[PDB]
Ligand binder design. Sequence first.
Ligand SMILES: [Mg+2]
Ligand SMILES: [Mg+2]
Ligand SMILES: [Mg+2]
Ligand SMILES: [Mg+2]
Ligand SMILES: [Mg+2]
Ligand SMILES: [Mg+2]
Ligand SMILES: [Zn+2]
Lengths: 132, 315, 77, 116, 208
Amino acid sequence: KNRAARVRVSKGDKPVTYEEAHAPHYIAHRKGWLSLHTGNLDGEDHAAERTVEDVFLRKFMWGTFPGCLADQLVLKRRGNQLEICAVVLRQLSPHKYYFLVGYSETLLSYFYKCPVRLHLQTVPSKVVYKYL
Amino acid sequence: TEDFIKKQIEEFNIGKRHLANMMGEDPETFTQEDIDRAIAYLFPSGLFEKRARPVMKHPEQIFPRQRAIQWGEDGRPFHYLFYTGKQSYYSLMHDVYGMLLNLEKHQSHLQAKSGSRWLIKEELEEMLVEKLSDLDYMQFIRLLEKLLTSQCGAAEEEFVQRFRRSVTLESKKQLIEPVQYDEQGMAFSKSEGKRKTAKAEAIVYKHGSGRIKVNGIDYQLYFPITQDREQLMFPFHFVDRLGKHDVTCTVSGGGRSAQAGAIRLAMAKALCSFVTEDEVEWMRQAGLLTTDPRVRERKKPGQEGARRKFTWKKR
Amino acid sequence: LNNIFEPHVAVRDAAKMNIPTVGIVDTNCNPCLITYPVPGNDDSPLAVHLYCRLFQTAITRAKEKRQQVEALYRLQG
Amino acid sequence: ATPSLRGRLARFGNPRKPVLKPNKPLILANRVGERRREKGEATCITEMSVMMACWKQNEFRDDACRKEIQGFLDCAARAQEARKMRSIQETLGESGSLLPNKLNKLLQRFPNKPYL
Amino acid sequence: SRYSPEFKDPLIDKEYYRKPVEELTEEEKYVRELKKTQLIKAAPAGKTSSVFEDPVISKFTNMMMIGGNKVLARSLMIQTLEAVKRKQFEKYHAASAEEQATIERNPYTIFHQALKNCEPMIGLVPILKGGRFYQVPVPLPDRRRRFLAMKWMITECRDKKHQRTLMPEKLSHKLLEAFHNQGPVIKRKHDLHKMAEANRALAHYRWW
RNA sequence: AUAUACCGCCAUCUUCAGCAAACCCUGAUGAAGGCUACAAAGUAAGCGCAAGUACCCACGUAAAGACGUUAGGUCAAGGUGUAGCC
Ligand SMILES: [Mg+2]
Ligand SMILES: [Mg+2]
Ligand SMILES: [Mg+2]
Ligand SMILES: [Mg+2]
Ligand SMILES: [Mg+2]
Ligand SMILES: [Mg+2]
Ligand SMILES: [Zn+2]
């Protein structure tokens, strides 16, 4: 059994979302891509550095928000304008959210030589699609 | 339930208003096709699935046809045949049985006083909010057939035609190539052709001898094997016209047999200009006016040649 | 009895949910769960038209007769 | 006519010896048995025998006695083609033949009620 | 594979369709066929509506080709045909008069007669009953016996060879010997026939 | 050192279609079963194929094909439990 990143169908009790709920072969059909940059085309290079930066940013966003995030994060590498557009939960005070957003933007702009602006989305919790 | 539907409808209409305002046209003339075009232009979804497309239609298409309530505050259902699972299906069965017995009575009285297709189970269950099986559907189709075979008239005729449809086109005849004149070009015609990765453009004439030119030079220097010569002679032989038709094709890409078949197909499709339609039908039914999509099969990462496996033994 | 010669399940489930059943038992049925049985033929063509019409006349004297008592209570309000 | 079984089965009211001792109870079911089919034929033997005889009589060439071998081949081909065409395209027949489907359908339409 | 169902076979004959106005049955048939005009398959690169060929010759040429060498098989067939033609003409011009007048020079009739003579009549099958293989004579159709004779001739012309022998003149001599009712393929046919006759007491083991 | 602690990546079965939440009936309410369209108690959210995506369309090909047997292959993509050591 080719057990991939798809959700196993067993008992109806796992609040699975919509992102990783689909099969890994429906990416170019019923899904999409979290990251997007010019390194994924013919004739371009420096893709290893882009992948390292992407995985480091993902780890940093997952560590700085222990549960404040819902699913994942969409990457938009517009040459020299990174945008970590994601969502936010309605559980903490807005002051803490503003503080964390400002700290992350300052760290990004002063470390990766790139300004970052966020676009938070008001959701109650995890975007659940099936209770299976 | 109705409150959420009204919320969706008001959201849809305010979104349509905003879209007609941002596009620059009048909201009354802002049809649904323009809505879809604007959504596709503003939200370019580059996927392969046709269901994952950004749509903004009426909530009647997004939400399925909800089953209405048949009982009121008193508890008595609104339909007569409700305490049996299926209501509309059994009502239609009773109606068609009544029509059948009416037709039988009318036929008995007459004896004493002396393009389209049927419905589909999927279409039926999508039109009527009701689920059925296959045996009952076959029985209903047989009852409809018995209704049609009987002596119909006007009322029963329109009643059985309301449960009909309309088939699409069935004449798959190709377009007849007209006669083109390009600078003193009498009996001039061109065609194309694509088979086994080979593109040919034959130029059939009706005023020369009996030779074939491939890329300027004759076909003898380009087709040394008699196989291609016979393949190109077959179309001219099927019409009994050899020494009165000259061609000059410019084929490119593919091997000898692929280019020969491409030129043959081009000649067959170009000869449909100075002959009747019965001859081109005879040529099509014999194997000329048809495509040959025999392309090389995609090799699999584990098989020898897209069919045979590797070296799988038993011990 | 249906088309297999076997007692139907509706008469068995009626006594389960405390629901009476007025059936027409002939001579090969099980008139035990029926609260109001009556021996009578139910296979002749001209016979079944009698019971079906008597049940129709009972409606014309039950729901149609309801209007005779609706005017008595509507005099006050 | 069917013979009666008054003192056949060993019951409590039979002061004698049982003559019929079946394995399964004498209660019929609601299905009919399958018709007999798939048997060995091996027809056309005398023709092959006389063909081998006329081959051994003359030389190995079939020019001295071609009529016998020709008739044998014709009969064999006719029989084979007839059997194949029949078993491929026709299985009904006329009035009264191989009828198992409708038979079991009628048996299920009027089954047996052994549980009173 | 790459062809859907309910499709017909590409026709080869032309004179039958040059004037199909004989009677009414075939007229209605061809009219109903051309009405819906289904997607007829394309003609392969081996069939031709010419009258200077023969389907048996084409089948033999296709069977002779090993792997993917159509030009090689075609050249070998042309060489065999020209060799038998030259041999016929040499034995015609080097004779008397009665022999020259009582024989023909058409190689097609000679090849057809050789095929009809080398065609077997009975076949044996190794029926495994109880653990032993016993040969039982069973009837065979015409096409199967023709294919068996063709393959026997092919394998005799191929396998049976030494070192100094050739191939075109070898096959020509083999066909000329098979036409004269004295050939190795006819010898193998007679051996198979006598072997089947020696075991004729096993026809009762067949079940069809 | 243990895949007889895993997460993770896969295998013949898989060249098909069956399995799991909520009810009722029959087995005197025992383990269990619930198939008869000229129909005697079956309704079934969900899963996998069919339905669907792409290539040469509706053919064909590719991608996929559940709940598990093999304590199946691997602590030896990569990291974590238990033993002994700096
Ligand atoms: Mg796999
Ligand atoms: Mg017994
Ligand atoms: Mg282990
Ligand atoms: Mg499917
Ligand atoms: Mg798969
Ligand atoms: Mg191991
Ligand atoms: Zn009854």
